[PDB]
């Protein structure tokens, strides 16, 4: 594995993860509200992982965890974002 292959793979993992966030916004809001985000995102996550797999080396896919790391980041950011907007929507004048 080269540093350049690792950079491209991390960039792809992050792009897939933010695609999932951007194009499923309403589903993600409800999933965070109902504590079933991974349930509601099941098909997107699996299709995203398969896309990632087709575009990186077997070595990167099996030994690195770039896809998992990128999904975890987007889930943490989404939880903070959605809870903050919900809080704001009933704490304003």
**What is the C-alpha end-to-end distance of the chain, expressed in Å?**
55
25-33 and 66-89 helices cross at what angle (nearest 10)?
A: 80
Single out the residue of 21, 53, 13 nearest to residue 40, CA to CA: 21
Angstrom distance (rounded) from CA 78 to CA 91 = 20
Domain chopping of the chain, boundaries:
3-89
The C-alpha atoms of residue 88 and residue 32 are separated, in whole angstroms, by 16
């Amino acid at each position: 594995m080269t540093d350049e292959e690792k950079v491209k793979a991390m960039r792809l993992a992050r792009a897939i993860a933010s695609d999932i966030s951007l194009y499923n916004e309403q589903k993600i809001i409800k999933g965070i509200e109902q504590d079933n985000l991974f349930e509601v995102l099941k098909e997107e996550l699996e299709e995203g992982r398969e896309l990632y797999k087709s575009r990186v080396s077997q070595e990167i896919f099996t030994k690195m965890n770039f896809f998992e790391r990128a999904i975890n980041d987007i889930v943490l950011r989404s939880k903070a974002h959605v809870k903050s907007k919900i809080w704001g929507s009933h704490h304003h004048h």
